[PDB]
Amino acid sequence: SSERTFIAIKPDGVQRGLVGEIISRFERKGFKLVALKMLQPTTEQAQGHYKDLASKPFFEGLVKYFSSGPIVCMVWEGKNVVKSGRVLLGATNPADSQPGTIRGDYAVDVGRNVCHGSDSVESAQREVAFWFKVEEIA
Amino acid sequence: SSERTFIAIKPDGVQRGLVGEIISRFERKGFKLVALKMLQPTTEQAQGHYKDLASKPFFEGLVKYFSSGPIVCMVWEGKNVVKSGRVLLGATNPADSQPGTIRGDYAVDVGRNVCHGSDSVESAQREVAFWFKVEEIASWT
Amino acid sequence: SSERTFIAIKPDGVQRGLVGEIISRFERKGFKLVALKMLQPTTEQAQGHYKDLASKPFFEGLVKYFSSGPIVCMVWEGKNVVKSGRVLLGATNPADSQPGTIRGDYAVDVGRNVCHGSDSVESAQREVAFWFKVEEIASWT
Amino acid sequence: SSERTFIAIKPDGVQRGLVGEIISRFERKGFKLVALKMLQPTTEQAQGHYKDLASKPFFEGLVKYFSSGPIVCMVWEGKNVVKSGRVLLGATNPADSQPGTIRGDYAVDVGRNVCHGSDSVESAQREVAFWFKVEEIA
Amino acid sequence: SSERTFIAIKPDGVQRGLVGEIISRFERKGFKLVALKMLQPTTEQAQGHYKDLASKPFFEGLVKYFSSGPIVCMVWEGKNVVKSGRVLLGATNPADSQPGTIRGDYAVDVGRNVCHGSDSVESAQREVAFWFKVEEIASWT
Amino acid sequence: SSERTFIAIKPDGVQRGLVGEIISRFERKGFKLVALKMLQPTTEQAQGHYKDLASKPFFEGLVKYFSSGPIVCMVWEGKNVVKSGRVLLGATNPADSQPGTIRGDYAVDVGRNVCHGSDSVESAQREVAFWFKVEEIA
């Protein structure tokens, strides 16, 4: 119930006008929004977000895209919010994403995948701490 | 076109799960979101927000309500966005609000009117400066 | 706030699959559902419902239409719920109805106007007693 | 085509303002609503609804919750309406419920699961007869 | 009831992904779709469409915009469908448009007003003949 | 990215007022509509659409239904639009169609399945060419 997850709507999600849509899907699940802000990520932050792929191909283009414009960062709170958050977004692979999910309804690309969610509670604590100051959290 | 307005979703709007709904209505109109944050207002900020009603007996209930929980602050950018924002929200008094507008669809109280919008370009410049730092405001295309 | 109004979705509203849509619009406004049932009106009930038009030549077509199939009866509770219910429904004549309202979005006929709402607190008290038993009305918070 | 199923929106479903939403999902499937009422279940009825769990744990709290406030009872008619009704609601387990379904979109708990549907035609005939008088059915 | 009107979704409406949304609003009203096509207007057709403004200096920007990409042409059938179509679209100038209407919800420019509707039965008969062949128009129940 | 698929909303889809709904689901996926028209199919065309089933049962009734009224033909363009198009529609079998998909939300029958999508790129090139003239395509 005090569980928290980090959700980030990426620059494509913002440009396509899907910010309210994504938030609505978490509100209607019954999750509690406890932190929220918009910002344009720096290159260093984009690199941090994708640090697991630095030796991986096209890492630069991922980084460029992530910092190509403003994103919206959220912290959602609730039971199983990390795992439920993943389910709401849908499969990482649009060839497997199901309609009813955000990526299923809106995402066509696996890299520009509209939104990000924490893959574990461990990832979430780290991601929340990275993007948010303690004070910004209700 | 570089015009900006301040929109605030109040604690009832947040508690009732209307945050995304309200944002979606501005995105559909074609307005550009350039600042966004959640915060729990201090008593002082709530009082500043309602400063024109400081001598009224319900000034107290407004402030108490406004700071009762987290709110969501936005800055929207676009042509006529200030007046258009008012039109999207609907009449401040839901008893005058038309369905299709946010207050028309969701608000039942004149006090709990879900959200606030700037009444002028002058008010908007003031409200944005009050709630937002220059850095917190984006400039994308 | 303990105020109650009677809302009826008519047979066309039911046949066109608008039952949930209409109920959702009252839930969003923040009104409280306290009675709900489906029934097929008798000729006598339909006539009672339209009693003020009993001397009109289209009284017959109204009654026939009203009892043509099952209707859905509701009682909604909340502040200003009677007048607000009327505003949510829109003008009785869809030719005067504004988009955003139920008749504005869905109704094309002045006769088949999808739904009915009580015109006053007095009418509502009468209509609820006519369509509902005291037991059929809930009292929750 | 004369097949019928029983659907009950539970006290949480009513308080969260989801009554119209759930009905809309059955109307848009093309099912025919033939009985509908709101009532606050008695303790005896709540016990009846959960009779399969009386020797099961926290049975009292389930019963308390079911009768904690008004519910909305429905009878929907159509082909495969029992099985289709289950699919529309989604998996009993929110860790398996899919977005697009009612529980997938709205339910976070497995007990307070927003709504109920008949698990079989046999269960349906019994449930419909229990909650509804023959006269209340169109 | 056999009345018909011409509705056109303009290139901005198509590019912004509002085609289905606009069609859904006419289907909900209960109007009957009897002709539908996508095409990219020629300069000559765009000029014909705006012929009443041929002497105006912004005639050029309208035509350029109207033929900037594919549009979607529709013919809707039903009682009062011409005037009702106008009401569903909302004021031609989004600065007068009410939320609940298409322009009220989506349009920000007086020039880019998303869509067009026939202003009269006379205009509709003319517009349908101009954009559609007799064969392209269905007659179902 | 130049990939195209053929989508046809059938006479039931049009009568139930689902034309805008289906189109909206492709627009929000990010696919590009490049051809669109309404027409009442001839018997010969209905036979062509179902040619794989001519030796199959009730083939006549399928044909009668397909030409029972006006349909809406579309060509959608985008990456994986053929396969994504299938996923958006959902399983051919309503006992397997998932809510969130068009058939999952609206279709109750396997024959009157609301809409049609190309099963392959090969089928798509053929179907597009059959229903559309080159000029009708943007």
Numbering used by the authors:
A (entry chain B), D (entry chain B), F (entry chain B): 2 to 139
B (entry chain A), C (entry chain A), E (entry chain A): 2 to 142
Sentences from the paper on this structure:
NDKs catalyze the transfer of the γ-phosphoryl group from a nucleoside triphosphate donor to a nucleoside diphosphate acceptor, using a ping-pong mechanism involving a phosphohistidine intermediate. Here we report the crystal structure and spectroscopic characterization of L. braziliensis NDK (LbNDK) under distinct pH conditions similar to that faced by the parasite in the macrophages.
LbNDK crystals belonged to the space group P213 with a dimer in the asymmetric unit. The LbNDK monomer consists of six α-helices partially involving a core of four β-strands arranged in a β2β3β1β4 antiparallel topology order, as observed in canonical NDK structures. As demonstrated for other NDKs, LbNDK also conserves the key residue His117, which is essential for phosphate transfer, Tyr51, important for catalytic mechanism and Phe59 that stacks with the base of nucleotide substrates. Analysis of symmetry-related chains in the crystalline unit cell revealed a hexameric arrangement similar to that observed for LmNDK. The dimer interface (712.4 Å2) is more extensive than the trimer interface (467.9 Å2) and comprises residues mainly from α1 and β2 elements. The region not modelled in the LbNDK crystal structure (gray) contains only two amino acids residues (Ala146 and Cys147) that are not conserved in LmNDK (Val146 and Ser147). The trimer interface area of LmNDK, whose C-terminus is structured, is 727.9 Å2 whereas in LbNDK, whose C-terminus is disordered, it is reduced to 467.9 Å2. Besides the probable influence in hexamer stability, the lack of the C-terminus interactions at the trimer interface exposes a surface path formed by Pro12, Asp13, Gln16, Arg17 and the region from Val109 to Arg113 that might be explored for the rational design of compounds to inhibit hexamer formation, considered essential for enzymatic activity.
